[model samples]
Target: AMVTVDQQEILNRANEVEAPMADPPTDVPITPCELTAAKNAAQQLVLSADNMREYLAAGAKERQRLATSLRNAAKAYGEVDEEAAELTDTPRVATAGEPNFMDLKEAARKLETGDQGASLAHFADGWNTFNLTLQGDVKRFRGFDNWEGDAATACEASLDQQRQWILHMAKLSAAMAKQAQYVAQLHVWARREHPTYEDIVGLERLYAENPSARDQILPVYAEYQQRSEKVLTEYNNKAALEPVNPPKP
Candidate 1:
């Protein structure tokens, strides 16, 4: 499913990126300036949530450096769609060919829907080939009591999570080009499957045997079925058109 973008939310999201705070502006609530900064920055790139709390630990420099990408991430990740918050189709940019928040969300969701739910090993393979940009290369942080201390290392995940997604975003972008493929395939299959009365009967019996199965499959297939029924009807018209009436005498 493709997620829908909300202009206001995207606009409001600017708050976090624009904030003047060098580090995440802890417990202190967001200010108008932060939204403006987030907007201006997005007017380059967006930011998220536990998930959100991590920001507080990110410190100043990393936050400042990550401002643009953070907002970009939020715009992609925080989106909502019908049925679920997930997207209806891939939202990645084709040229960039990267996975953004939605793909990650869908990938995560899709993985869970799979048999093992832990079949995430494949993604690591993708990740290996994935061109990763190290956090240090883009931005680093000032840690705890000693900004240079080990605590600085702790902040890496949030900052890295925020900044690194741009790469992931680019990776997922490739899917957009072929986004219509899977559904189109389903329609193709449905049209082929229901060409005769026998096929419709078979589908009905299967549906009875597995009621909810169609809940997931039927939606995309419905049009195909309806279309095929009409097509076969016309194609078979009184069965005369479809008959082998050998040449009349």
Candidate 2:
């Protein structure tokens, strides 16, 4: 049996990314300049979170496409067409009222900077919240955990070469999940007091400017850069329309 995903649940997860923070306490005195600076910084954090939310959604869509490929292959293998389609189709959910990234960016620009105490704390909390979402999204992608195991089991149990080929599409989907995880980690690294937000070019400059930051990010960045290439190459090779062969019984 395939693990079914609810589009609305994914949508709700995205909504959590853009949820507004509680208003910062006003009892502390903050200079206009300090407030402006803090607000700008906090807004950048928000922007980064928003970008990650979109990235997560994009991963879900890619999973859907992989399912389509699997569905097609299953049909070719003489599996009941409706049954295979039902198992592999990830229904596209309505995106109405999904927070627009650009709109969030604009709102971030208008953020009011707060004082060193409460205001700074507020911005710090914002970063923490963003990190929380990042962690949540990692698990959200792993919600495919059962799917991967089940598909692999099916691939192994099937005697027919064609059926094995169709079931093995799950491997590709698993690779995509790993890709999402590497990316989300990269974003977390970039958002960590660097102001880069996952731009390769910006990160390079940041590394040159700060060895400490580079030390923290380079290992994660290196693995992601190299491993993602490997994952894509493997995906293209396996996912070609050519039939896959199962081991001889």
Q: Which numbered prediction scores highest in TM-score against the true structure?
A: 2
Q: Estimate each model's TM-score.
A: 0.21, 0.26
- Looking at model 1, which ten-residue stretch has the lowest summed lDDT? 240-249
For all candidates in order, the CA lDDT equals: 0.31, 0.35
For 98-178, candidate 2 gives per-residue lDDT tens digits of 221222222222222222234433433444444443333322222322223454344323313323332333333233333
Model 2 earns a TM-score of 0.26
Question: After aligning candidate 1 to the native by TM-score, how far in Å is the CA of 94 from where it should be?
Answer: 27
**Distance from true location, Cα of 37 in model 2, Å:** 2.1
User: Could you report the Cα RMSD, in angstroms, for every candidate shown?
Assistant: 26.6, 21.2
lDDT at residue 102 of model 1 (Cα atoms): 26
Model 1: what TM-score? 0.21
